[PDB]
Design an enzyme around this catalytic site. Structure first.
Site, PDB file in Angstrom:
ATOM      1  CG  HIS A  40      -0.382   0.205   2.517  1.00 39.14           C
ATOM      2  ND1 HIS A  40      -0.020  -0.853   3.328  1.00 39.14           N
ATOM      3  CD2 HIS A  40      -0.107   1.329   3.221  1.00 39.14           C
ATOM      4  CE1 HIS A  40       0.446  -0.387   4.472  1.00 39.14           C
ATOM      5  NE2 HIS A  40       0.404   0.933   4.434  1.00 39.14           N
ATOM      6  CD  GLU A  52      17.195  11.297   6.081  1.00 32.48           C
ATOM      7  OE1 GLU A  52      16.773  11.900   5.072  1.00 32.48           O
ATOM      8  OE2 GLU A  52      17.591  11.884   7.111  1.00 32.48           O
ATOM      9  CG  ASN A  54      16.326  16.029  12.258  1.00 31.33           C
ATOM     10  OD1 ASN A  54      15.408  16.198  11.455  1.00 31.33           O
ATOM     11  ND2 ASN A  54      16.561  16.860  13.268  1.00 31.33           N
ATOM     12  CB  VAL A  57      18.063  18.596   9.932  1.00 28.94           C
ATOM     13  CG1 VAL A  57      19.415  19.284   9.824  1.00 28.94           C
ATOM     14  CG2 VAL A  57      17.024  19.547  10.502  1.00 28.94           C
ATOM     15  CD  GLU A  62      21.305  13.227   6.053  1.00 27.23           C
ATOM     16  OE1 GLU A  62      22.502  13.446   5.772  1.00 27.23           O
ATOM     17  OE2 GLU A  62      20.630  13.976   6.786  1.00 27.23           O
ATOM     18  CG  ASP A  84       0.361  -4.218   2.786  1.00 25.02           C
ATOM     19  OD1 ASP A  84       0.771  -3.671   1.738  1.00 25.02           O
ATOM     20  OD2 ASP A  84       0.056  -3.576   3.812  1.00 25.02           O
ATOM     21  CG  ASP A 171      -0.230   0.102  17.485  1.00 25.08           C
ATOM     22  OD1 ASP A 171      -1.437   0.338  17.262  1.00 25.08           O
ATOM     23  OD2 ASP A 171       0.437  -0.709  16.808  1.00 25.08           O
ATOM     24  CB  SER A 172       3.187   0.686  14.027  1.00 18.92           C
ATOM     25  OG  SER A 172       2.058  -0.139  13.800  1.00 18.92           O
ATOM     26  CD  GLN A 174      -2.641   6.218  10.756  1.00 21.07           C
ATOM     27  OE1 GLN A 174      -2.447   6.470  12.041  1.00 21.07           O
ATOM     28  NE2 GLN A 174      -3.373   5.305  10.364  1.00 21.07           N
ATOM     29  N   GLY A 175       2.528   6.703   9.202  1.00 23.03           N
ATOM     30  CA  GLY A 175       3.860   7.137   8.826  1.00 23.03           C
ATOM     31  C   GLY A 175       4.864   6.011   9.035  1.00 23.03           C
ATOM     32  CB  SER A 177       2.704   2.100   6.295  1.00 21.63           C
ATOM     33  OG  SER A 177       1.437   1.691   6.777  1.00 21.63           O
ATOM     34  N   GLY A 178       5.218   0.051   6.068  1.00 24.70           N
ATOM     35  CA  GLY A 178       6.326  -0.392   5.235  1.00 24.70           C
ATOM     36  C   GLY A 178       7.611  -0.604   6.007  1.00 24.70           C
TER      37      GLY A 178
HETATM   38 CA   LIG Z   1      18.520  13.828   7.787  1.00 27.32          CA
END
Ligand SMILES: [Ca+2]
Lengths: 223, 58
Positions: A40, A52, A54, A57, A62, A84, A171-172, A174-175, A177-178
């Site tokens: 999804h 990554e 932060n 920033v 990165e 999924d 819990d996990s 929104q954001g 996912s995956g």
């Molecule tokens: Ca960063």
């Protein structure tokens, strides 16, 4: 991640952020050129961000690499959420070295009670919204298929498992996912769905990676 | 059955943080909201333009 803790800069080297102009999903690096995420989370123009901490920033470790291929499982059902899982090929190979590393796939499925590490940059509030700058971590146990089905009647397939605490609070969200659910150094789950965040009797639901190892290996090798 | 343009935005059960648009009849404008990635309802658009074309004036 609700009820978790600050992981620490690059302490989860296989965690990646999927970016489409902003962070929308997480993922797990399994090879220098491949990432595992949720079906999804399929989006066009995905950019994978590795190394990554932060997410808002540039800190110097990165690696931003665009997806060259985003392969959703051929049997993904957008209604039942079965299968999924999605594999993302990186346009160029990622440089692996301490802060950026791959996570091993499982050799066998995990049993109920197994403690795992779930991570992500998702919402940290069960009520309201607050997105963290740095990566958040959460230790949570895999739950029995029986309890998972009791929590979500007629919604749990053989390719899903619940993880978390029935009391709520962790819990996990929104954001996330995956993202990864790693147990004993093996990627056992992918953050998939739930009912609200950290709510009582409503644990998170995750894609059962152990059922896809053959498919993952063959798909990556044939692309 | 009713005008889907008047239904509140639906995030859904999946846990992604995807920005989508929904028509807010109370404010008379297309606004952004967080979509979880699955089971989208119809008052969910990929752009303000799509939202306005479909629900503008609702
Ligand atoms: Ca960063």
């Amino acid at each position: 991640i609700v009820g978790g803790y600050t992981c620490g800069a690059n302490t989860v080297p296989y965690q990646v952020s999927l970016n489409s102009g902003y962070h929308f999903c997480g993922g797990s690096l399994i090879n220098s050129q491949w990432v595992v995420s949720a079906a999804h989370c399929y989006k066009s123009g995905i950019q994978v961000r590795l190394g990554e901490d932060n997410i808002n920033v540039v800190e110097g470790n990165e690696q931003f690499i665009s997806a060259s291929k985003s392969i959703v499982h051929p049997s993904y059902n957008s209604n039942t959420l079965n299968n999924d899982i999605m594999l993302i090929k990186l346009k160029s190979a990622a440089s692996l070295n301490s802060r950026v590393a791959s996570i091993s796939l499982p050799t066998s499925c995990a049993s109920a009670g197994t403690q795992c590490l779930i991570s992500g940059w998702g919402n940290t509030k069960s009520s309201g919204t607050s997105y963290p700058d740095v990566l958040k971590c959460l230790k949570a146990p895999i739950l029995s298929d029986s309890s998972c089905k009791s929590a979500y009647p007629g919604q749990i397939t053989s390719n899903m498992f619940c993880a978390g605490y029935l009391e709520g609070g962790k819990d996990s969200c929104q954001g996330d996912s995956g993202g990864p659910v790693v147990c004993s150094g093996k990627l056992q789950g992918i953050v998939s769905w739930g009912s609200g965040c950290a709510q009582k009797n409503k644990p998170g639901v995750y894609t059962k990676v152990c059922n896809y190892v053959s498919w993952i290996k063959q798909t990556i090798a044939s692309n | 059955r009713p005008d889907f343009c008047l239904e509140p935005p639906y995030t859904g059960p999946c846990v992604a943080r995807i920005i989508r648009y929904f028509y807010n009849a109370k404010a008379g404008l297309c606004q952004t909201f967080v979509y979880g990635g699955c089971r989208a309802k119809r008052n969910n658009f990929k752009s303000a333009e799509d939202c306005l074309r479909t629900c503008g004036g609702a």
